[PDB]
Subunit: 74 residues, 4 copies
């Protein structure tokens, strides 16, 4: 298998793990707040679609590996 193949598989798994861990990670971050715990958690929930869109999708693995210089090499 090529290096491009390795790069996409490795990055795809990193993004998949990041996407699934992000809700819990952001929820826990709100625990650092006192009088403002609930407002923080409501913020996280209300903006969850936006926040989760911060992780690239599997379709982006190739162009990301191109940026690293390993996919679709001349």
């Amino acid at each position: 298998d090529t290096e491009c193949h390795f790069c996409k598989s490795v990055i795809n798994q990193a993004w998949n793990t990041s996407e699934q861990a992000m809700p819990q990670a952001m929820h826990q971050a709100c625990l650092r707040f006192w009088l403002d715990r609930q407002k923080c958690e409501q913020f996280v929930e209300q903006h969850m679609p936006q926040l989760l869109a911060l992780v690239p999708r599997s379709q982006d693995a190739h162009i990301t590996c191109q940026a690293l210089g390993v996919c679709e090499a001349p």
Copy 2:
């Protein structure tokens, strides 16, 4: 207002920290799915580790990211 901005930066910073810490394990898991090419996959990761770890934004990016989400006006 700035408290929403405060929430956004804190939750996003935590997600990025969690993602960065998990990335080596995640990429390792991706190479274990290979049989004859486990070693080749792991070699790719080792040679490109500084680049791959650079795929997670740094805390300095929390404010502008939250500006893109529409919560940290300026």
Copy 3:
């Protein structure tokens, strides 16, 4: 002199150019909507700071060049 220096300077200049060009580019994109040109331009106006925030800042040059493999 270092490749890292070249990479950071060159990418930052591209981002500055992109940031400078983005308002006109988005205005032209609204021309593709027929009968809803003003609604599209109204969207652009309402979300301009967010859209402009999509261009990375100079502070991101180093980590971007690190991903490209030229800055440690």
Copy 4:
């Protein structure tokens, strides 16, 4: 009337296409800033152009970018 999501995706894709088209000249001009080794800078740009151009998102990324801005569900 058409959706805000449709405006957002078209507007961002247009911006990215403009950036991608302008990037080669912009980076070439950026090397003029180096007065001791301009040719070395231009060599870096040329050698790494495929990587540099890949920093512009592709049209397939319009939806998720507009989702991050909060306009596409």
